[model samples]
Target: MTQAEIKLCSLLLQEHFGEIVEKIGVHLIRTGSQPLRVIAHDTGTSLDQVKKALCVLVQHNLVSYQVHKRGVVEYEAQCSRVLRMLRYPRYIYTTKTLYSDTGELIVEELLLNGKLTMSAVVKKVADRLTETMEDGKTMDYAEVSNTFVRLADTHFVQRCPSVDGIYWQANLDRFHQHFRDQAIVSAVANRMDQTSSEIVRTMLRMSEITTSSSAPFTQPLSSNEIFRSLPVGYNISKQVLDQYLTLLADDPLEFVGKSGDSGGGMYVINLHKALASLATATLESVVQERFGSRCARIFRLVLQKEQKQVEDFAMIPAKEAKDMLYKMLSENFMVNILSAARMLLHRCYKSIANLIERRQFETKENKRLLEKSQRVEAIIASMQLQEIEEMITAPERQQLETLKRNVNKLDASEIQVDETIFLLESYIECTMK
Candidate 1:
C-alpha cells in the first residue's frame, strides 16, 4: 500500500472505531503472548462495550485473535487503506476562500434591494468591515459608527433606528450597478495606472545613483546635497534637515581622538547613539510640524542603502562588474538603503553608539520613514489620475478612489522573492500546466 493510502485508512479507522486494535496490539507486543487473559476494565462500562469495540476492529480487518484469552487478543495495523489510496490521485475540492468576507456583497445588494434585516446582514457586514479596517491600527467605536451612518446616508445602504441604535441595510442592485458602471471602473483603473507609474519613477530615480557611469564617480553626495535638491521649502527644509543631521552627528557630544596611523585614522564614533538622538529630534520636529516631517526618515532610508551595498561589496572578492550583477540582484536594495544610512551615521558621529544601545529611536523613526515612503508611493499610484480625469466627469471620483485603493493594496502585498518567483511560476502555470 502507498504511504498516503495507509495514512488515510489509519486516520479513518482511528476516528470511527475505538481503541480496540491499538489496545490489543499494545498488550500483545508487551506480553509477548496471545491467548493471555486480559480483562478490559473500565468504570461505568460492561463487557458488552468491549465486545462491540473488538467486533468493529475485526470487521475493519484491523485485528484477529481468539476469545480463549478472555478479553486479551492480538492485532495488527492493516495497510489495506494505504495501498488503496496509493493507486491513483484522489480528486477533492479544497476550498480556498472559506474565510473570505462576504459582507461587501451583502451590504451592496441590500442597498440596491432597498432594505434588509439588521440581524441578517449585520454579521457579514461587520466581518467585512473589521477585515477592511484590520490592515492598520484599530479605529474607535465612534469612527465605525460615523462610517456606517455615512454609508446609509448615500443610499448605498439603509438603516432603521430602533430603541437601542441604528441598524444598517445595503442597496444591492444600486451598489452593484454603481461599481459595475464602465465609466466608474475605468476611472479607477486610470488612477491605479498613474500610481504605478509614479512608483516606478521613484524606484528608477533611486536606482540611478547605483548604476555604473562612464565618467569617474565623484565622492558620494552628502545629506545636504540630496535634501537641498528635493523640491520643498528652503528655510523650513534646511531647519528640519539640520536638526536631523545634528542628532545624527551627535552634535551635543565631544569627539575623542582616534587610534590609527598618521595617514589614516580609524575614528571610533557612536553611530547608534547618534541615530537615536536624530530619531528623537525628528520625532519632536514631526510633532511640532503637525506630523508632517519626512526629511529625517528620507535621509536615513537613503543612507541605509549606501551602507548595505558597501557591506555587500566588501564581503565578496573584488571582481568584474558582470560578476556582481547576480549578487546585487539577490540583495534587497530597499533594505540595503536603510542599513547603509545607519552605518554612515554611525561612522559620522559618536553619540549614535549610545542611541543604539538605548534602542529608543526605532519606533518613531520607522513611523516618520513610513510616512515619507507612503507619500512617494501615493504619487506613483496616482500616475493615471490625469488620464482618468480626461475620460470621465467629476462624479467618477468614486471610481478613481476605488482604483487607487486596489493598486495600493497590490503594491503593498508584493514581496521581493514572490515577485521573482511569480514570473517563472506564471509562465509554467499558464503554458506548461
Candidate 2:
C-alpha cells in the first residue's frame, strides 16, 4: 500500500472507530508488524489505549496479529480490508435485497462489531429491531437466529476460527463476487437480451458451487446441469434455455463459450472476456471524450484486431492515414493504459478520502443541529399526544434539509468512486497477474 492508501485507511478507521484507533492503525501500517510495547511507545499512547485500539482493529479484521519472538505478539495492518470499509453500505444493501431486513441487520451488526458470537449477534439484532417498533412488538430471537443461519448458508457471513469461542464475520470477497456477477449479467443484458442474461446468471450460480472463487473463468457446466439449477420462480422452457445458451456461446463478446461435446455441450462463463469487454467499452468512452467519436471507432477497430486495415478503412489518401497511424504508434497503448490505471487507482483512493472527510465535517458541523432536530421531533410527537401546541422552527428545519442534501451528495460520490475503483482494480489485478 502507498501513502494515499494509508491515508485513506487511516481516515476510514478514524471515521468509524475513532482517533486513537486510527493512529495505531497508521503506525502499524508504516512500521509493518511490531510488538505491543513498541506500538504503544511509538504512538506515545498509554498501554491500555493501545491494547484497546489493537482489539478494535483486530476485531474488524483490519489488523491481524500473530505470535512473534519470545512468545510476544506482533500486529500488522490489513490495508485491503481497511479499504473495504468504504463499501460497507453496498454490502448491507446487497444482503437486504437478497434476504430482506433481518439479513441486512445481521450483516450490519457483524460489520459494526467486527466479529461476534452467533448467539450474541442474534440477540443484539433482535434487540435493535425491537427498538424500532412503535407498538409493543418484540422481535423474536428465533426469527433473528433463522436469518443468521440462512446468511451462514449463503456464505455472506462466515464462521471465524477461534479456540475461545465460535464467532461470525462478514465475508467481503463473497459480497464482491455478488457485485461481479451482477455486472456480468448486466453486460449480457445490455449487449443481448434479458433471457440471455438470466441463462448466464443461472449458469454462474451453478458453477459458483462447483468452482473456485478466484478463478478467471468458471468451470464448464453442462446444459442439463444449468437447467436443473435454474431458480424455481423463473419460467423458461427447456428449449428456450438451450437456444439462449447456444446464442450466448456464439456471441462475439465471448461472454460464454462451449467447452466440449458432452452433456448437451459443456459451457463455461468467460470471466476474462467479460472483464475485457467492459474495460474496452470504458476505454472507448474515455478515448471518445478526449478525442471524438471518429477516433473512438478507430480505437475500437484497433481493439477488434483490425489495426492493419485502419489505414485502408480511411476514405482519405493513404499518406494521411499513414501519418495518423505513425503518430499513434509513437506511444504504446498498453503502457498508457497501465500507467493511467495506476494513476487513477491512486486518485480514486484520494477522492474517496476527500469525500469521506467532507461528509464527516458536514456531520460534525451540524452535530448540534442534528441533535436538536431529533429532540424537537420527539417533543412534537409528545405535544401531539398531549394536544399541546409546539413545533420546530422553520430555520432549523431548512438547515437540516441543507445538511442532508450536502451529506447525500458526498455519499453519492463515495459510491461512484468505489465502483470505479473496483473496476480499475479488477483490470489491474488481471493484467498484472
Candidate 3:
C-alpha cells in the first residue's frame, strides 16, 4: 500500500525482466488496470513488445489479467508477488532444511518457473540434481517424484488443476506458517526447557487441528487435553508436564495464559504476547549494541511500563542519563516493542526502495562500459593479436573487474537487508488482524 513498495517493485521488474517490461509494469502499477492498447500507448512501448512483456509478467505471476464486465481484457501488476522475488533464497534454504537437496531444487524450480506440470517438474528437478553429481549415477524420476508428493501432501506445493493440465506453485503461506511456529517454539525452549517447549508445540498443533481460527489468542486447551495429545513415547511424566505448564503461566511475558481452574487449568497460546516478547528481546540487544548497557536498561524499564527518572537505576549522572534517554526517544518511542518494530518496518521499506534504486542505477552505468570492454577484447582475440598492440589497456580491464566486484558486494548487502525486512514483516503479520 506504500509508494516505496511500488518503487521497489518497479526496480525489481527492470532488474529481473527488461526495460520495456519495467515500463509497462510501472504504468500498470501507477494507473491500475488497463487494456492492451492503453498499456502500450501509456508506456510508449510497441504494441507487440507490450504483449510479449505481459506474457512474461503473467507467466511469473507478477501480473494478473481478467476481462472487464463489458468483455474488454485488462492487466494489473501484482506488487506483493513481485516483491517476493527478494525471498527466493530464503525459500530455497527452507526447503533444503525440511526435505534435503532434492526437495530444495524442486522448490527452486517451482519458484523460478512460477508453475510447472507434475511430469515436467519432476524431470527438471531430476536433471538439476543429476547434474550436480560426478559419479555417473543419474537421479531417477521416481526418487524426485517421491519428494514432490511429500511436499504436496504437506501443502508446501500448491496443486492447481486447470482444464489443460495440472500446475504446481510453491505455497508461500504454508512456509511462513512453519517459520512462525518454529520461532515461537524455539523461543519457548530458549526461555524454558525443551520439555516445556514441546508442551506448547503440542498445544499449538492440536488447536490448529481442531479449527482454522485466526484469532490472536488460540482456543484454550486444558492440561488433560494437552497430555492426551502428546506424541506417543514422549519421555516427560504427567507431573513434569503440569510443572512446566505452571512455569510457562508464571512468566511475566504471559505467552501461555490460564483461563480458569477448570480441567486442571485451561492454558492458551497468546500469539500477540509471544511475538511481542521475541521483539522485545531483539530491541534490547540492538539498543545495548548500538548505545550501551545502561541505555538498554533504560529501554527495558521503559518497555515494562514504568514512569520514573533514569539516573538512579542507570548509574549515570542525572543530566547524562536524561540526555541518553532523550536521544533514544527522538529516534523513536513505542508504547510496546511491537510498535517500535512497526515504526522501523515503515522506515525499512523506504530505505530499501532507495537502496535498490541506487544499486540499479549503478549497475546500469557499469553495464554499458563492461559491454564495450567485452567487445574490444573480442575484436583483439579475433584479430589474433595475442602479442600485438592492445585495443583496451590492462588498467582499464582491471577497473572494469573492480567495478563488477563492487556491484556484487552491493547485491549481498541487498540480500542482508531483505532478511531484516522479512523478519519485521513476519512479526507484524503474526499478530495482525
Candidate 4:
C-alpha cells in the first residue's frame, strides 16, 4: 500500500476500533507475522489486550491469521484491504438505497460491533428508527428480521447459531462490489455505455453467484465466456462483447485482461490494478477533505510530478507554498523521500517533531480552559439550585457561556491538532523496521 492508503487505514482504524486496536493493527502490519506473545511484548500491551485487539482486527478483515497447529497462531495484515474502508460510506449509502433503511442499519450494526446476535441487531435498528422517526414510532422487529433473513439468504451477511441465539456477521469479503467491481462498471459506463457497464458488472457478480457449482472468487472469463456469463437482459451481441473485451484488456481502464494464450485465455478483472487505482483515487478525495485546498493542491502536484523546493508549487501562491509544505510535514502528511539529489529527507521529521510539540502545548491549554469551564459550570448549577435568584448575575452568565463556548472551540481545535499526533504515530509504526 502507498503511504496515502496506509495513513487512511490508520484514520479509519482509530475511528472505528479505538486507539488500542489501531496500535495492534499497526504492529501486525509492520511486522509481517507475529505470535501473540511477540506482539504483546513489542507493543507493551498485555497478552489479553493483544488477543482482544487481534480479534477485532481479524473480524474486520484488516488482519489475517495462520494457525500453526504445532505451536502458536500468528497474525498478519494487508494494508491494501485495510484502505478499502475508505469506500465504506459509499457501501452503506448504496445499501440504504438497495435494501431500505432497515437493511442499512443492520449492516451498520454488524460493521460497528464486528458481529452481533440477532436480538442485538434488532435492538440497534429499533433505536435508530426511534431517533429518526416521529414521536411514538413503534419498533418493527418483524420488518428488521425480514431484511436480515434476506441478507443472509443472499450472502451479504452470514447467519449462524450456536449455544447462543442466532448471530450475523457482516460479509466484508464481498464488499469489493461497491468499490472495485463498481469501478470496473463505471469505467466501462463512462467510456462506453450503460450496457457495457452492465455486462461487466454481471460478469463480475456471476462468479460469486455460481460459487456453488465451481470457481473461486477470482474466476476468469474470455470474450465468449463473459458473453455466456451475462444473465438474460444483460446479454449483448457477439461483436459488442468482443469490443468490450478488447477495450477492457487495453489502455487506461485495464480492468479486464487475459490469463494466457492457452484454452482461449480467460479474461478477468485486473484485480491488482483495479484495487490500486481505487486506493489512489480514494486518497485523492480524503486529502481534499482532511486538509485545505492549498495542501491538497500541493499533494496532488507531488503526485503529478516531483518538483524541487516548495516554492515551485505553481498551483498555489509562491508565498503560501513553503508554509503549507511545513504544515503538511508537521501533520505527518509529507513522507520523506530518500533522494540523493537533495538534503530534504531528514528535515521532515524535525518539522514533525516541532509541530507535535506545539500540538502538545495547545492541548494543555485546551484542557486548562475546559477544566475552568467545568468548575464554573458546577458553581452555576449549585447556585441555581438554591434561593437568591439575583445571585445569578449577568457577568457570571456571560462568563459561563463564554467559557463553555471556549471549551467547545478548543475541543474542535484539539481534535484537529491530535490528528497530527495520531497520524505521525501511525506513520512511525508503519515505517518501523
lDDT (Cα, tens digit) per residue for candidate 4, span 1-433 = 3444445556557767888998889777767788899999999999989989998886665776776767788888876556445445545665687789998888887776655778888888977877897788687888888887888776778754331235577665455434345655676788777776776687777766643211222576666666776778654787877776676667565666767645445776654455434434434455687777667777766654433653454656766776776766665556332221012212322333344345445545566554655665577665234434345566655755665565566445544433332232222332333
Backbone clash count for every predicted candidate, in the order shown: 51, 0, 0, 1
> Which wins on lDDT, candidate 1 or candidate 4?
4
Instruction: Compose the digit string of candidate 1's lDDT tens values, residues 88-184.
Output: 1110000012112242344443433323455445444555466667476643444434444555554545553331133344333233223222222
Q: TM-score of every model? A: 0.16, 0.84, 0.83, 0.51
User: In candidate 3, what residue range of length 10 has the lowest lDDT sum?
Assistant: 207-216
Clashing pairs in 2: none
Better of 3 and 4 by lDDT: 3
- Note the Cα lDDT for every prediction shown: 0.35, 0.80, 0.78, 0.61
RMSD (Å) of each candidate, 1 decimal: 28.7, 4.3, 4.3, 9.7
Kindly list the per-residue Cα lDDT of model 2 for residues 261-368, writing each as its tens digit.
597889988886686666666666655765566656666666655435666665556664555455345423332555656666787898898898888888899899
* Lowest-sum lDDT 10-residue window in model 2: 382-391
Reference-based lDDT, residue 34, model 2: 89
Off by over 4 Å in 2: 163-165, 233-239, 282-339, 364-396
lDDT of 3 by residue, 1-433 (tens): 6777877887889888878888888888879989999998887889999999998887776777878888998988867678788878888989999999999999999988876888988999899888898989889899999999999888788875332236788887777667666778998888778888889889878865453333467788889889888988697778988998999999876889987769888988887777777767766766786788877877777775432643455555677667776767776753456677887766667776777777767767777777777786676665256544365568867777777787787767667666667667777776767
Once superposed on the true structure, which residue ranges of model 1 sit more than 4 Å away at CA? 1-139, 159-168, 180-433
lDDT of 4 at 167: 58
Best by lDDT: 2
